[PDB]
Design an enzyme around this catalytic site. Structure first.
Site, PDB file in Angstrom:
ATOM      1  N   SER A   1      83.939 138.295 -37.958  1.00  0.00           N
ATOM      2  CA  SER A   1      85.209 138.852 -37.504  1.00  0.00           C
ATOM      3  C   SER A   1      85.177 140.358 -37.227  1.00  0.00           C
ATOM      4  O   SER A   1      86.144 140.888 -36.688  1.00  0.00           O
ATOM      5  CB  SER A   1      86.313 138.518 -38.503  1.00  0.00           C
ATOM      6  OG  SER A   1      86.682 137.151 -38.316  1.00  0.00           O
TER       7      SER A   1
ATOM      8  N   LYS B   1      86.088 141.347 -33.644  1.00  0.00           N
ATOM      9  CA  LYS B   1      87.460 141.482 -33.145  1.00  0.00           C
ATOM     10  C   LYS B   1      87.738 142.897 -32.622  1.00  0.00           C
ATOM     11  O   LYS B   1      88.526 143.086 -31.701  1.00  0.00           O
ATOM     12  CB  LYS B   1      88.488 141.095 -34.215  1.00  0.00           C
ATOM     13  CG  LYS B   1      88.533 139.584 -34.532  1.00  0.00           C
ATOM     14  CD  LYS B   1      89.686 139.253 -35.506  1.00  0.00           C
ATOM     15  CE  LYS B   1      89.846 137.719 -35.720  1.00  0.00           C
ATOM     16  NZ  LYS B   1      88.582 137.161 -36.282  1.00  0.00           N
TER      17      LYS B   1
ATOM     18  N   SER C   1      92.533 138.566 -39.959  1.00  0.00           N
ATOM     19  CA  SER C   1      91.348 137.974 -39.338  1.00  0.00           C
ATOM     20  C   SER C   1      91.612 136.587 -38.745  1.00  0.00           C
ATOM     21  O   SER C   1      90.779 135.688 -38.888  1.00  0.00           O
ATOM     22  CB  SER C   1      90.185 137.885 -40.341  1.00  0.00           C
ATOM     23  OG  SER C   1      89.778 139.159 -40.800  1.00  0.00           O
TER      24      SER C   1
ATOM     25  N   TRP D   1      83.314 137.761 -42.256  1.00  0.00           N
ATOM     26  CA  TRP D   1      82.664 136.818 -43.146  1.00  0.00           C
ATOM     27  C   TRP D   1      82.116 135.672 -42.315  1.00  0.00           C
ATOM     28  O   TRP D   1      82.871 134.857 -41.792  1.00  0.00           O
ATOM     29  CB  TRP D   1      83.641 136.315 -44.213  1.00  0.00           C
ATOM     30  CG  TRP D   1      83.020 135.467 -45.286  1.00  0.00           C
ATOM     31  CD1 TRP D   1      81.754 134.928 -45.303  1.00  0.00           C
ATOM     32  CD2 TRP D   1      83.645 135.055 -46.505  1.00  0.00           C
ATOM     33  NE1 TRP D   1      81.565 134.205 -46.458  1.00  0.00           N
ATOM     34  CE2 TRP D   1      82.708 134.269 -47.213  1.00  0.00           C
ATOM     35  CE3 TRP D   1      84.908 135.272 -47.067  1.00  0.00           C
ATOM     36  CZ2 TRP D   1      83.000 133.696 -48.452  1.00  0.00           C
ATOM     37  CZ3 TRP D   1      85.189 134.709 -48.302  1.00  0.00           C
ATOM     38  CH2 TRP D   1      84.238 133.930 -48.978  1.00  0.00           C
TER      39      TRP D   1
ATOM     40  N   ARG E   1      83.876 142.997 -51.017  1.00  0.00           N
ATOM     41  CA  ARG E   1      83.509 143.835 -49.888  1.00  0.00           C
ATOM     42  C   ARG E   1      84.249 145.167 -49.959  1.00  0.00           C
ATOM     43  O   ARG E   1      83.629 146.231 -49.946  1.00  0.00           O
ATOM     44  CB  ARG E   1      83.784 143.103 -48.566  1.00  0.00           C
ATOM     45  CG  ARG E   1      83.006 141.791 -48.441  1.00  0.00           C
ATOM     46  CD  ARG E   1      83.475 140.950 -47.266  1.00  0.00           C
ATOM     47  NE  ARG E   1      84.811 140.420 -47.507  1.00  0.00           N
ATOM     48  CZ  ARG E   1      85.523 139.763 -46.596  1.00  0.00           C
ATOM     49  NH1 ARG E   1      85.011 139.535 -45.391  1.00  0.00           N
ATOM     50  NH2 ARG E   1      86.746 139.344 -46.888  1.00  0.00           N
TER      51      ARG E   1
END
Length: 241
Positions: A47, A50, A94, A187, A227
């Site tokens: 993602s 994006k 996301s 992810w 993360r």
């Protein structure tokens, strides 16, 4: 120093996976973590793509920041995705299906040309326009992701400045101790091993930009919050946050 570097390596060690954190200031990059070789290894962007999807879409007027992408009513992977949303809403959540819609609007030919023109990763999107960032063939290194974020932050990517402005606005997370934090998580759970990402930058009070890309292997028992967690404490340890 190495006082700092060892503390960051130990962050990855505690969660029992391998990872790297790339930091970019000016034109200098540094890598931290317990597997520094990841920094120059290619992975699917998942993602994090994006960011570029949005840039391309906005540049060529395939979507606006105010229009609403309707939910068709079919069940999606997460309940949070099961609603109408704007590109900005979908960036924060996301919401993959929304950006697959955008990818189809752009289409394979334009997408490929633009991905090549920007020189993103290995710049190979193959023949499937709505999943190439999730399962291949498109791949990118954490060094390249940090550089990408640094250019986006400085608006020196090859897109109109206002388009870069609008995508920045979508990536704003929060303001922490006078620092503005921008970021996009990723992810890749459809590949093995799974890849986890957090790519972004910090605007410090005087305007200085500090770009980063966290990249680690996601494992069973390691929550997605790791993360941002590792990224922030690493940034605090480096005196950046």
């Amino acid at each position: 120093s190495d006082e700092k570097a060892e503390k960051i390596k130990n962050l990855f060690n505690e969660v029992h996976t391998t990872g790297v954190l790339v930091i970019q200031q000016g034109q200098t990059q540094q890598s931290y973590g317990n597997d520094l070789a990841r920094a120059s290894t290619e992975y699917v962007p998942a993602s994090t793509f994006k960011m570029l999807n949005a840039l391309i879409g906005l540049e060529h007027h395939k979507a606006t920041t105010t229009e609403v992408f309707k939910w068709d009513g079919q069940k999606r992977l997460f309940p949070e995705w099961e609603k109408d949303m704007t590109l900005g809403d979908a960036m924060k959540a996301s919401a993959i299906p929304v950006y697959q819609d955008l990818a189809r609007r752009i289409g394979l030919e334009l997408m490929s040309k633009e991905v090549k023109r920007v020189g993103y990763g290995n710049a190979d999107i193959g023949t499937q326009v709505d999943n190439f960032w999730l399962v291949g063939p498109l791949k990118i290194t954490p060094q390249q992701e940090a550089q990408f974020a640094y250019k986006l932050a400085n608006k020196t990517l090859p897109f109109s400045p206002k388009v870069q402005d609008e995508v920045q606005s979508m990536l704003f997370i929060e303001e922490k101790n006078g620092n503005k934090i921008y970021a996009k998580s990723g992810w890749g759970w459809d590949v093995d091993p799974q890849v986890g990402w957090l790519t972004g930058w910090v605007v410090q009070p005087q305007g200085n930009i500090v770009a980063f890309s966290l990249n680690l292997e996601m494992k069973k028992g390691i929550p997605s919050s790791v993360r941002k967690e590792i990224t922030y404490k690493s940034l605090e340890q480096l005196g950046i946050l």
